[PDB]
Amino acid sequence: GQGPELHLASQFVNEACRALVFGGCVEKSSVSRNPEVPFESSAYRISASARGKELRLILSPLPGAQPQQEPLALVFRFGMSGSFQLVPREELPRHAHLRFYTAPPGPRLALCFVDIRRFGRWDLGGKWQPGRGPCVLQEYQQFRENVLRNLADKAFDRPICEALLDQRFFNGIGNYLRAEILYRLKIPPFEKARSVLEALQPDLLELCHSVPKEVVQLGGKGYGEEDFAAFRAWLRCYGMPGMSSLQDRHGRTIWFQGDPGPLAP
DNA sequence: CGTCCAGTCTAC
DNA sequence: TAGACCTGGACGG
């Protein structure tokens, strides 16, 4: 997902796991090339926060849990198909690559990282990816300053539609969001990023926050079929009849209305 | 049956 | 910059 999906996922983990207790180890599918999570507690709580296009899980053993353990943090990136599900322990989805098991009593459940295509990754450290900018949703002011302070960077030489996917400056913005954001301001996607940003030192950086916030407010996105209908109705540009599309220089499709802009292939 | 379409990560 | 990493749904023959 993009920032809204990662944020909604962290809300899902927090609400779903609020009154649950996990115990045991953290089980990884054999096909997953991500790392074994070395963690075991008889009793632990799982919580989450999102930052841009990453989600951090905290594994927090209860007072007296055994073996002795300090809380463990994991950072996840979802790639194209990452998600979290709470399922019954013996009805694991097909691509459940990492699982946390509730402890008794009550119905035995599993929190699963589900990633069909396996583009998602996790690391043990618990730290955000060095180089990712601040979260367009939760760190708006830091995000805004981080762009306006570094317009000399060669990243802003590129078309604006390309610059919007550079996670050093737009941590959380993905393909649908770049289309939806430029269509609201009818900024051509192949206008030069520095030209559109230089003129700011509600504008484009504000919509980098407010547009994703709109997606979050829809709620849901399986966090199931009706939630999906609401997102489809919300979209104005991405994939919509009457809209043009081109390939950016990395082969990713940009949707827009009218003028493609000066740097079009 | 086939092609094509849907965010990093890394070797050239 | 170009290809690599993957699976499943749509659609075309």
Author numbering: 2 to 202, 223 to 244, 249 to 290
What's written in the study?
While we also crystallized the complex structures for more lesions in this study, we were unable to obtain intact substrates in the active site of hNEIL1, presumably due to the residual glycosylase activity. Hence, we introduced an extra E3Q mutation to the truncated hNEIL1(C∆95 P2G) (see the “Methods” section) and succeeded in the determination of complex structures containing 5-hydroxyuracil (5-OHU), spiroiminodihydantoin 1 (Sp1), (S)-guanidinohydentoin (Gh), dihydrothymine (DHT) and dihydrouracil (DHU), respectively. Despite the very different chemical structures of these substrates, they are recognized similarly by hNEIL1. The damaged bases are fully extruded from the DNA helix and inserted into a relatively loose binding pocket, which allows the accommodation of substrates with varying sizes and shapes. One edge of the flipped base points towards the protein and forms close contact with the side chain of K242. Noteworthy, across all these structures, we observed an unusually short distance (~3.0 Å) between an outwards heterocyclic nitrogen atom of the nucleobases and the terminal nitrogen atom of residue 242. Based on the similar overall conformation and detailed atomic interactions, we conclude that such a tautomerization-dependent mechanism may be a general strategy for hNEIL1 to recognize not only Tg but also 5-OHU, Sp1, Gh, DHT, and DHU. Accordingly, K242 is more likely to retain the base in the activated state compared to R242, or in other words, the activated state is more favored by the genomically encoded hNEIL1(K242) compared to its RNA-edited counterpart, which is supported by our QM/MM calculations.
